[PDB]
Design a protein around this ligand. Structure first.
Ligand code: 4G9
Ligand code: 4G9
Lengths: 237, 237
């Protein structure tokens, strides 16, 4: 049932009242942001996984960019871009607010997100590699970006990037730090102690712990991904 | 007095109570967004222009990226990234809200901003050109992106990107459309009629009209810019 929908599959049909739909992919770190917010805010939702190597024709109607995550509500409104879906969920649904009310504190979280901006493309370059010589250079590129995040934690004198308690910014940058160990990149945080202590503190958060994918599951997906397999998205039953 | 501050200049000192400071550059389209918001919301402010070809040492303390626009308030809080400065100004100051209260309508504006994302880099490629052969190809690249904006106006059945009246998204994407005529790129909107009618309607907005820089002033700045002159930022006294 959690199996990804591809070419030849039928459109999902209307989203029922009282629930929101997320078009996701179980191994997508960008869609993981939305799922972390949905869980944290306890929002009632339905998941539809998209086979990103063999996309359905109807998926481009949901998002012209053809990317996960996408939200769809009962009135048929469509929201895409991982950071936009996350802000939308915090505003449109009740409970503990992940984004702070203060305009400056809100701005700060968005500034920290911009400081992290180069990390996903760097994770992408490390994955798609042809030789072991490029590895040391990319590791230094990681350190250069991870030092930007360290300076923020040092200046704020706080555990998390948004305060003493976990907030939106932590969930937005976490998926890439989650995959560092599986990719054997833990040494890239050896010069950022406050960033290293932030990771262990994050791993203990009940929301983060519940959605955390295993080392072998990421290694198994990435193996099929680097083979451009249409079974990658469906790795692990 | 409106003259840009460069190497050898002294730090500005504290921002007084009741006013906000913007670190800008009179020809910067990204900083123009912030200035359009400051004007539209009638915010009391002080402008400090930065010589971007010969930056002051103290400017990297205001923004690690060393880019304009930057906001600084009386309590010393610093806000950078043009879109972040604009959202901050709408939330922290009273009057007519440029961003709508509705979470979906807010999300939509941010989605339209993402649809425009490739235009500034395209304007940059057209400016830095070595031959007239690349011109036709880049014009087609413009049409491909300007068609994304046309589809939004067509679907919404509205004059502006955020409704029947001007909002935040219009001010955020305007500076690049402002410079199209000066760069002789008006033919790139010949296949987007609703986008072409949006430009003329924008040119009539009192906020847009008041901050509008002349054709020759942009041509004169760009000439000095493509000469990498430290007088570019100060073109036109
Ligand atoms: C949703 C998505 O883009 N998923 C995905 C899968 C695998 C990797 Cl390595 C990444 S990434 O963020 O590292 N990058 C875009 C290559 C993302
Ligand atoms: C503030 C700034 O970056 N100013 C600037 C000056 C000249 C041009 Cl052409 C641009 S652009 O947006 O076209 N691009 C970054 C080249 C921006």
């Amino acid at each position: 049932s959690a199996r990804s929908l591809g070419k030849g599959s039928a459109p999902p049909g209307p989203v029922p009242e009282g629930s929101i739909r997320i078009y996701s992919m179980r191994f997508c770190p960008f869609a993981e942001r939305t799922r972390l917010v949905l869980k944290a805010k306890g929002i009632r939702h339905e998941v539809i996984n998209i086979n990103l190597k063999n996309k359905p024709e109807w998926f481009f109607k949901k998002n012209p960019f053809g990317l996960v995550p996408v939200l769809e509500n009962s009135q048929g409104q469509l929201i895409y871009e991982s950071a936009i879906t996350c802000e939308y969920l915090d505003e449109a649904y009740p409970g503990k607010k992940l984004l702070p009310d203060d305009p400056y504190e809100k701005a700060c979280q968005k500034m920290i997100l911009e400081l992290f901006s180069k990390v996903p493309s760097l994770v992408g370059s490390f994955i798609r590699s042809q030789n072991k010589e490029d590895y040391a250079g990319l590791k230094e590129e990681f350190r250069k970006e991870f030092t930007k995040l360290e300076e923020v934690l040092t200046n704020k004198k706080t555990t998390f990037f948004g305060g003493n308690s976990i907030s939106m910014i932590d969930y937005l940058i976490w998926p890439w730090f989650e995959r560092l160990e599986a990719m054997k990149l833990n040494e890239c945080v050896d010069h950022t102690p406050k960033l290293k202590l932030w990771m262990a503190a994050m791993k203990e958060d009940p929301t983060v712990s519940a959605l955390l994918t295993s080392e072998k599951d990421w290694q198994g997906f990435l193996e099929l991904y680097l083979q451009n397999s249409p079974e990658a998205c469906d790795y692990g039953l």
